[PDB]
Design a protein around this ligand. Structure first.
Ligand SMILES: Cc1cc2nc3c(=O)[nH]c(=O)nc-3n(C[C@H](O)[C@H](O)[C@H](O)COP(=O)(O)OP(=O)(O)OC[C@H]3O[C@@H](n4cnc5c(N)ncnc54)[C@H](O)[C@@H]3O)c2cc1C
Ligand SMILES: Cc1cc2nc3c(=O)[nH]c(=O)nc-3n(C[C@H](O)[C@H](O)[C@H](O)COP(=O)(O)OP(=O)(O)OC[C@H]3O[C@@H](n4cnc5c(N)ncnc54)[C@H](O)[C@@H]3O)c2cc1C
Lengths: 472, 481
């Protein structure tokens, strides 16, 4: 009745499902346990995929409904939103990708066990299904990939009705007349922008003094915010939320104050989106009984092979320290499993990119100016505006800039920060450059195709390296 | 002073005199000035920027971008996303205006860059009248002598004529006329299925034209394109409605009294005579180097059989202080290629080493899907006897492509069997043009397929398809396919 396995992965998100595939490809007999109805975890089901789908669709809606298409000779009498249809495009993509993971498991001989996994022994996982049935896996190694959940706001109860997390905000049935977003991080700006574009009056309230979350370069963040404000996305920074009240008529009263000061106000909305953060998920996993203690933020401590204190039990992804990003989880899962097979285990978190899929996009990798200043690293700056880039001007899509940070003496690239068109794709060239220890001069001399947005990356490096660009 | 137009005819002394202001010449001139050379740039046309800016890359990319969006709104795409529109109509004058606005801004940008960098702009027709002298003839008949230590020939290219077919930029157009058509032609025939022909054909096909391309060779996309990529690309374009008659030669064309054009064709090798009728005939069978009335013969600079100026690895002609770069010399006729040759040539004038690796120069086709490649094709690797392995990954399995419902094509990686070195990267699909620069960076370092597979590519991005194709080439199988 029990299944014997070499590697049992708990969770099927970007970290878990890729680790399970990789382990099977390496020859391990591999089981993946998932408690939800579909595979793919947060990113695929309530995360990256549905959010990017709505960002794409609402951007195009804005281009048709506003001024952009008219300026290009694409004239349309009546542009109307069919939100049910826009949601159906999103759901169709989620369904196709979740089914794809199921096929990949079959193709690579990963055993998929449906149930709530609990570690019941150093070499045993028990999966409990919805009806209480059980499936025991006796296993050599256990890989915890149980991911994350929304961080609640104390005193405000999310009900996914009028007070939503990102999950509810991704599936609203109608465009809310007025929406408030608690938290101007990546998720908050992305989801706020979606609904702003579709007609909602949107205000984001943020305790800190900048948008875009931790580690974003402050110059980029200010310029990004200014652009979003011109689009109609309103911001109350340096503002704390003291509470929210569900009212009888179905509306929500949000009480706010100056983070430091006393500008007490109340603003009323139809939908309140709570996205102040996400946190590691380890509930009812059996960790306490094993003696695996969590760090103060709820993460599982691991060593450089991603082993917990019990060496055949591992953890990767959103359940451990580091950036809570899908590509970070994926790489940790891969190298963890490579290490199980005896190989080297390497990830450089300074080469892990971050992206914001608004329009304009924002993307960066390496160090910000503030981080370099903190660390005492002397650096030089190169900037190149997309207004001077040939492809950006050709497309009449010219917001923003590339900023390169180079070490003063050695000319090594330390950081790349992109605000504008194509930032999300472009940052991967920058990640390669950082991984290789490239110099700013190296990047200035690579033959970039003309006309491309990437030429701005070339010119920004030239400005950092030689002092001057060619086209600005 | 910094502009020497009609009426400005005093002798000029220069360190470096650049003839032509296209991508090669105008960048060479800026860089030369930045290096400390007293720099003169001679241009005969009313605006700077050469073929690429005025009748080339820029106007073509503008219409490709705009016509793609027209297709998205007018066809099925926007409806499938919940964007409902009663009547989508084309305003061609307005679309052409967007194109012209971009060209004008960028041409003015070069002029500002010249002034900002103290490049002397001489407006006139340059002719080399001595080993250290160029004479510029201006519109008003004036002449101006520049005595100069070095001369940089960057005189670019022109459309290659088709014997027996007269281009009048009316109904028989070159790329220049095709970029400014006054109405969408009911039926268009394109002679030449190279990059320029496929781009311009696709533009007008999207805007409503019935488009057929006729090509003497047996593949689409021009020289050096990977054959698998080219075949799959052609198949995709045919499904869009773009028709091709490959392995076909054109025997003539006749403008008729009713304004239409009769194009006579036959099997390139054989005789399957047919006639196809169009309203507009686009002639783009090639481009060729431009050196007319430059003084080369009197200097004794003989041209190669295709009209290019021979140069050595420092881009010196036979006369050692006279150099040439860009579309007027051998190699791929591309803007970024001209620019890089100009930069290193001028750096060489200042004493530095001069080396460019043409195996790291990418090619891009800005259709939708795009096509882009750098390094070696499979055919080249086999010709050269190089043992290689193949990794492929389809955009249908890429998360960003699927989410955006934009899934044509694939990335194909070619890696060296022994060392895993990336030898070639070939991208057919969304975002190919930007993505190929990641491969160009890799080739400059001699990076491995494993190197690429282990870079943490952001999720979800199109670039992950590049990661996965490298993983397949390096380790035999990808993760998500
Ligand atoms: C709205 C939103 C947008 C985002 N957009 C992006 C983006 O664009 N790019 C990006 O890189 N990241 C993005 N993220 C973050 C990304 O989703 C996470 O970094 C990533 O999903 C973490 O992967 P993971 O495998 O560690 O965990 P998860 O994706 O959270 O997967 C964990 C899985 O384990 C399962 N599980 C947990 N406990 C058990 C148990 N005991 N038994 C069985 N199964 C269990 C869960 O059901 C879940 O399926 C976004 C997140 C959100 C909320
Ligand atoms: C429709 C089209 C689309 C294209 N798209 C792309 C693309 O997407 N990407 C790409 O990389 N390439 C593209 N190209 C090719 C690209 O434009 C050329 O490779 C590039 O312009 C060559 O640059 P160059 O500086 O060598 O010459 P040119 O750009 O041809 O510039 C030569 C200049 O010299 C001037 N001149 C010539 N003789 C004299 C003289 N005696 N005195 C004074 N001035 C003189 C000419 O007036 C001209 O301004 C395209 C070409 C066309 C036709």
């Amino acid at each position: 009745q029990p299944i014997d396995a070499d590697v049992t992965v708990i969770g099927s998100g970007p970290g878990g499902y890729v680790a399970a595939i990789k382990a099977a490809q390496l020859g391990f007999k591999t089981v993946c346990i998932e408690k939800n109805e579909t595979l793919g975890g947060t990113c695929l089901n309530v995360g990256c995929i549905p959010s990017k789908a709505l960002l794409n669709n609402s951007h195009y809606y804005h281009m048709a409904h506003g001024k952009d298409f008219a300026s290009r000779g694409i004239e349309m009498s009546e542009v109307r939103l069919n939100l049910d249809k826009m949601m159906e495009q999103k759901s169709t993509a989620v369904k196709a990708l979740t089914g794809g993971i199921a096929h990949l498991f079959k193709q690579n001989k990963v055993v998929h066990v449906n149930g709530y996994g609990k570690i019941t022994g150093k070499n045993q996982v028990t999966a409990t299904k919805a009806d209480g049935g059980t499936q025991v896996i006796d296993t050599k190694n256990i890989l915890i990939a149980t991911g994350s959940e929304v961080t609640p706001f104390p005193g405000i109860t999310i009900d996914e009705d009028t007070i939503v997390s990102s999950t509810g905000a991704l599936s609203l049935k109608k465009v809310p007349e007025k929406m408030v977003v608690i938290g101007a991080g990546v998720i908050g700006v992305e989801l706020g922008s979606v609904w702003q574009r579709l007609g909602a009056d949107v205000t984001a309230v943020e305790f800190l003094g900048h948008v875009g979350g931790v580690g974003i370069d402050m110059e980029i963040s200010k310029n990004f915010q200014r652009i979003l404000q011109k689009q109609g996305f309103k911001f109350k920074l340096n503002t704390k939320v003291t509470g929210a009240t569900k009212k009888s008529d179905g509306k929500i009263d949000v009480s706010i104050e100056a983070a430091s000061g006393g500008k007490a106000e109340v603003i009323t909305c139809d939908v309140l989106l709570v996205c102040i953060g996400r946190r590691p998920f380890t509930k009812n996993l059996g960790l306490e009984e094993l003696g695996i203690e969590l760090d103060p933020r709820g993460r599982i401590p691991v060593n450089t092979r991603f082993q917990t204190k019990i060496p055949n039990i591992y953890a990767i992804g959103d359940v451990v320290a580091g950036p809570m990003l899908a590509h970070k989880a994926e790489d940790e899962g891969i190298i963890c499993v490579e290490g199980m097979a005896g190989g080297a285990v390497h990830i450089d978190y300074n080469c892990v990119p971050s992206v914001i899929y608004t329009h304009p996009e924002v993307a960066w990798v390496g160090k910000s100016e503030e981080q370099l200043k903190e660390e005492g690293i002397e650096y030089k700056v190169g900037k190149f505006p997309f207004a001077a880039n040939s492809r950006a001007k050709t497309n009449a899509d010219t917001d923003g800039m590339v900023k390169i940070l180079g070490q003063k003496s050695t000319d090594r690239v330390l950081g790349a920060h992109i605000l504008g068109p194509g930032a999300g794709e472009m940052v991967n060239e920058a990640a390669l450059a950082l991984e290789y220890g490239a110099s700013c001069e190296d990047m200035a001399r690579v033959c970039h195709a003309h006309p491309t947005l990437s030429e701005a990356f070339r010119e920004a490096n030239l400005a950092a390296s030689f002092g001057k660009s060619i086209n600005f």
